[PDB]
Swiss-Prot record:
Subcellular location: Secreted; Membrane
Family, similarity comment: Belongs to the pleurocidin family.
Tissue specificity statement from the Swiss-Prot or TrEMBL entry: Goblet cells.
UniProt superkingdom: Eukaryota
Additional detail: The peptide is disordered in aqueous solution.
Protein task: Antimicrobial peptide with potent activity against Gram-positive and Gram-negative bacteria. Activity against E.coli and B.subtilis. Weaker activity against L.mucor, s.marcescens and P.aeruginosa. May play a role in innate host defense.
Name of the protein this chain belongs to: Pleurocidin
Portion of the parent chain present: 23 to 47 of 68
Length: 25
């Protein structure tokens, strides 16, 4: 069904992970 959308928002968000280390890494 909709399981093929594995955190579809996070997958795109981590693209700019260079500035995400402030609240991730």
């Amino acid at each position: 069904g909709w399981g093929s959308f594995f955190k579809k928002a996070a997958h795109v968000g981590k693209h700019v992970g260079k500035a995400a280390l402030t609240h991730y890494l």
